[PDB]
Design an enzyme around this catalytic site. Structure first.
Site, short mmCIF file in Angstrom:
data_model
loop_
_atom_site.label_atom_id
_atom_site.label_comp_id
_atom_site.label_asym_id
_atom_site.label_seq_id
_atom_site.Cartn_x
_atom_site.Cartn_y
_atom_site.Cartn_z
CG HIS B 41 -4.72 -5.07 4.62
ND1 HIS B 41 -5.47 -4.80 3.50
CD2 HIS B 41 -4.16 -3.90 4.99
CE1 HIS B 41 -5.37 -3.52 3.20
NE2 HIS B 41 -4.58 -2.95 4.09
N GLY B 143 -1.80 4.27 3.29
CA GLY B 143 -2.74 4.68 4.31
C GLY B 143 -4.14 4.97 3.82
CB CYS B 145 -6.04 0.42 3.04
SG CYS B 145 -4.81 -0.10 1.83
#
Lengths: 306, 306
Positions: B41, B143, B145
């Site tokens: 993503h 952030g 991820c």
């Protein structure tokens, strides 16, 4: 979101851990530049710990009596000196992994990360708070002595703790990196008592602000209080007296959540007198006091390190 | 002595974290050999998350659309492919800090260390358990991820988790390093529910053995029970059903402390029906279930890593 007991990344400190052997005692050392720092009771036998005269015990030691090992590589010791309760061993090789570093003496209530080691090899990392009685509630087995506690800002490791002793109560004591013990403790196997353990009130408040930030609001009350009156309640429950400095330090957290510090002090007062009634706050059925106001801001912002 | 929530040393994983930018989305990647792994993503805008067709969104992306940064140094991307929910970016440079590594898919109840990062820089490390509903209770801001979870044995990092999503309940979901989500979760901003969170019964028992090892014995009772009868009590309190395998795994802890597994099961039964009465076990007013039997043995022995 979410809030967790979090430790600094240990990569910089791992490259500084060595194995120190003197006689038959083996423990951990910290290799910065061309100096190795380790607890001075590495020169003690199991019997010497009962009443050591470190000066006399050290007279019988020479540079070649210290076996300093980094991996499969031995360091050559050219000099040795005793600074308080730590031994400084001069070696012929600067540590190529030496990070930007400082030696600091933290205050009661401050937190730090412990990299527990055995035989110079890192085993794990966890967060610890310097209790108001200058003990710490850590995890230290036989051979963990010399493991260090630290904080990191940007690129600078601030070394602040070195483990030396387990007390007969099961809690832990140590020195700063200059060898001075936190608290009235000595490196002798004798009965030593910590004082009354009290709760870090300013840390509980920051933890309550972290809870409100993350959605736990059930404890927010309709009352407020004064500094003196809240403190009068804090003595009964062995909480450290709250001061205007503590109030000032919590300002940022007060500003973000819009809850006055004296309000949160009143919500804490209700939790102290009425308990938690089987509820939890951030997944705990107790009142956590090992998160500083700075620990909360760091997690609620995302501070990183180079 | 002492017992603590402990994380593996993060030094090996730190040297594998990079920054991945695609368009205006920036997150973390894992750089092993000449491949960068990151959540797919990264190619989504804030609107795309509401209903992404990853295949179509990826058609519009080329190798030069991926900005991979390690420190001040950019990696050249030569290839890209989508494995389930992770993007594999082939770069022209093998990571000189690549440790011995494995990709593993852990089971519910197992634990691992999370190195939370932002913009490719490590921020902190903490321990997490794969909840029986395949969520984790971590600490993940905007952030984070791409932050990975891992276990270490000797010199081998076993990567097992990559963070992708925060659920509307505030808990966290992610994939293994092959891109397959733990649980029935998808990388879409839509309402997804975790199942009923249950307690890892075998982990509570190992934690009770760790307590007995460290001096906390007040909960040891004079009763014993059966597997079926204890399980009949475990369903009411949403505890995972205990099996002979769980009993077998606890054997070492049973052998050291001399307390039969079915005895500890009966002491747990009294704690479930009568509460803790305001007492604590290893400094907690709850029953901890995020320590595996192996986590207890490691701490009670002193296992280290190369």
């Amino acid at each position: 979101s979410g809030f967790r007991k979090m430790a600094f990344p240990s990569g910089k400190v791992e490259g500084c851990m060595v194995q120190v052997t003197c006689g038959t005692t083996t423990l951990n050392g910290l290799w910065l530049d061309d100096v190795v720092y380790c607890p001075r009771h590495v020169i003690c036998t199991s019997e010497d710990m009962l009443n050591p005269n470190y000066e006399d015990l050290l007279i019988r030691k020479s540079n070649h009596n210290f076996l300093v090992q980094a991996g499969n590589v031995q360091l050559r010791v050219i000099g040795h000196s005793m600074q308080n309760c730590v031994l400084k061993l001069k070696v012929d090789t600067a540590n190529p992994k030496t990070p930007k570093y400082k030696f600091v003496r933290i205050q009661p209530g401050q937190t730090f990360s412990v990299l527990a080691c055995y035989n110079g090899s890192p085993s794990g990392v966890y967060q610890c708070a310097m209790r108001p009685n200058f003990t710490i509630k850590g995890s230290f087995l036989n051979g963990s002595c010399g493991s260090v506690g630290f904080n990191i800002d940007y690129d600078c490791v601030s070394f602040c703790y070195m483990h030396h002793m387990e007390l007969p109560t099961g809690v832990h004591a140590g020195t700063d990196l200059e060898g001075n013990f936190y608290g009235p403790f000595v490196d002798r196997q004798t009965a030593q008592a910590a004082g009354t353990d009290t709760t870090i009130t300013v840390n509980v408040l920051a933890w309550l602000y972290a809870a409100v930030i993350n959605g736990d609001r059930w404890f927010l009350n309709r009352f407020t209080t004064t500094l003196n009156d809240f403190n009068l309640v804090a003595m009964k429950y062995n909480y450290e007296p709250l001061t205007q400095d503590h109030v000032d330090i919590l300002g940022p957290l007060s500003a973000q959540t819009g809850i006055a510090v004296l309000d949160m002090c009143a919500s804490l007062k209700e939790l102290l007198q009425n308990g938690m009634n089987g509820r939890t706050i951030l997944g705990s059925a107790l009142l956590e006091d090992e998160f500083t106001p700075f620990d909360v801001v760091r997690q609620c912002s995302g501070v990183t390190f180079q």
